[PDB]
Design a protein around this ligand. Structure first.
Ligand SMILES: Nc1nc2c(ncn2[C@@H]2O[C@H](COP(=O)(O)OP(=O)(O)O)[C@@H](O)[C@H]2O)c(=O)[nH]1
Ligand SMILES: [Mg+2]
Lengths: 169, 11
């Protein structure tokens, strides 16, 4: 096996917890405490390699957290998640990205832009607007639904692929 | 205190 430290960031309510639980336990949760931040370990084979993905599902935290601090030091890749029916969560994306660059002290940090809740019909964030933003950053964009599981494995697999390519350079 | 927010209180 090979270890990858991933972090899932994005506005409250975008579906970070639902995406992680769907990946880990293969189930969709309608409700998961928005204040809980925790780490998960997904065991899956990617491109032949057995990978152990330690994933930090983030939540708002004021007081110091040793687990959050460990991911601030060792986190290799980030899923920046917004919800396609929430323009405000899309507006936050550039701030999450700029902050990540400062955390890693690097202009090149493995990252994937995720547009979640793609099962919903009342779309307010255009796919073109998200694809343009992802193109401007030089990163992949993946539309997901934690509800149907659409794109969930792609989002995490692609991030692992990005970390592998960054490590090659 | 690393901004922008982004993640709140990231120091
Ligand atoms: N329809 C739909 N609802 C979702 C999806 N992902 C999450 N949700 C819902 O969005 C709300 C917030 O999800 P949650 O995972 O708690 O978000 P977090 O605050 O980013 O961890 C909950 O009511 C979830 O059931 C999805 O892909 N589709
Ligand atoms: Mg959550």
């Amino acid at each position: 096996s090979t270890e990858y430290k991933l972090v899932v960031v994005g506005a409250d309510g975008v579906g970070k917890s639902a995406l992680t639980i769907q990946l880990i336990q293969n189930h969709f949760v309608d409700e998961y405490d928005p204040t809980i931040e925790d780490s998960y370990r997904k065991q899956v084979v990617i491109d032949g390699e057995t990978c152990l993905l330690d994933i930090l599902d983030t939540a708002g935290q004021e007081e110091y957290s040793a687990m959050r601090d460990q991911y601030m030091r060792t986190g290799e890749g980030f899923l920046c998640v917004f919800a396609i029916n929430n323009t405000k969560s899309f507006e936050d994306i550039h701030h999450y990205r700029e902050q990540i660059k400062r955390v890693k002290d690097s202009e090149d940090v493995p990252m994937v832009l995720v547009g979640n809740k793609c099962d919903l019909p009342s779309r307010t964030v255009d796919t073109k607007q998200a694809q343009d933003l992802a193109r401007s950053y030089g990163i992949p964009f993946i539309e997901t639904s934690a509800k149907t599981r659409q794109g969930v494995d792609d989002a995490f697999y692609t991030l692992v692929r990005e970390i592998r390519k960054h490590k090659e350079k | 205190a690393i901004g922008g927010f982004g993640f709140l209180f990231l120091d």
